[PDB]
Amino acid sequence: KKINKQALIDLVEQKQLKAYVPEFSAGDEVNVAIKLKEKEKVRIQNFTGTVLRRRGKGISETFIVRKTTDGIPIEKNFQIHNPNISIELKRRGKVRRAYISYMRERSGKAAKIKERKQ
Amino acid sequence: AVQQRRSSKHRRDKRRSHDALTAQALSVCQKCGKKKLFHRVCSCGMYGDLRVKKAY
């Protein structure tokens, strides 16, 4: 009657995981298509921006996307394995950390991440 | 704060009623026979069948 709690939690999480779950590092630019539902239909709204963090293990995997519109910077936390949300990695960039917090302090020409990564 | 009335010689003993001591559990060593307090190495450094320390 030994109970591996982590395994049971993993099974509940597997019930609703996704197949692809594309990868991205901290400093990456992705395109997030929100399937916003009105009374009818869906309006696919894109939230293209730069990733800042990807934390979590399973159904609770979340990532941070930062965008700038009209000079106003907005940061948005998405859940990876959340329906009506589609992620498409666009550019892979090089960073030396996992949580690039300085992006919410540095802006303009100093907020540009060089490409390539390993 | 200090006692406005002196405590008699009876309340003192009633409080001390819980100050009694307990006899620690003892056992017999299996190689020399002297009493040692339980779950501890004896005076010969012989715990069970293992020579722990040199004899006293």
Partner: protein
């Protein structure tokens, strides 16, 4: 009323995404098949209840009086014994699982022993206010609050019974009501309950029919992912 009850062990907390676009935190309860160890009737006892046995264990881990009772009643040896009031309609010696008791999305309440916290102060225990920190202060900063009711022979001159002061907090039974069951897992004998359940992971948990909403069952369905592996 017609109260249904089951016993289980809380294993952790997760989340599930559901249709109508909500993210629902859930608690996972491992529910072993419970065995009805006794039925007590209204006429013969002056009240009605059902006592089940759960959390089965080997016979060498049980005391002599309890194993004698189990072998006299022809039951599986279990170390946990408890009853629920007003639970009727179950024959003695029948295995009961939550699938036969509750529906897919009906309302239930959950009772569990709260997480022990030890000797806590007045502020952490009774949501009291902390005294000022600057502009000059005194030795008691985390003060409980003046317990004066009346000074003088014409007034109380005593701390009133049931005052709010520091003491033991935690390790106490608490019930959270109107929690909707989300899903059943027959193979893993695993119940999904919305919201947060009190108690540490691995503690005992009692799932009962909600007295506030006894027959109310609010529909809930999960979301099927539409994703496709890379093109």
């Amino acid at each position: 009323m017609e109260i249904r009850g089951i016993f289980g062990v809380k294993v952790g907390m997760s989340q599930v995404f559901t249709t109508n676009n909500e993210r629902l935190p859930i608690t996972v309860i491992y529910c072993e098949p419970n065995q009805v160890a006794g039925v007590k009737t209204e006429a013969k006892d002056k009240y009605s209840a059902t006592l089940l046995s759960f959390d089965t264990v080997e016979n060498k881990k049980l005391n002599k009086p309890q194993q004698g009772f189990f072998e006299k009643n022809n039951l599986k040896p279990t170390k946990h014994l408890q009853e629920i009031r007003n639970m009727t309609g179950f024959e003695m010696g029948q295995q009961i699982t939550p699938q036969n008791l509750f529906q897919v999305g009906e309302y239930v309440d959950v009772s569990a022993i709260s997480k022990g916290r030890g000797f806590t102060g007045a502020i952490k225990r009774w949501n009291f206010k902390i005294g000022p920190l600057g502009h000059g202060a005194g030795y008691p900063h985390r003060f409980q609050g003046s317990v004066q009711a009346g000074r003088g022979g014409a007034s109380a001159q005593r701390v009133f019974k049931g005052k709010k002061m520091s003491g033991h907090y935690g390790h106490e039974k608490v019930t959270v009501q109107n929690l909707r069951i989300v899903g059943f897992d027959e193979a893993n004998m695993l119940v999904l309950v919305s919201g947060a359940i009190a108690g540490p992971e691995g503690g005992v948990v009692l799932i009962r029919t909600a007295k506030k909403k006894p027959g109310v069952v609010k529909p809930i369905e999960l979301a099927v992912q539409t994703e496709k592996a890379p093109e």
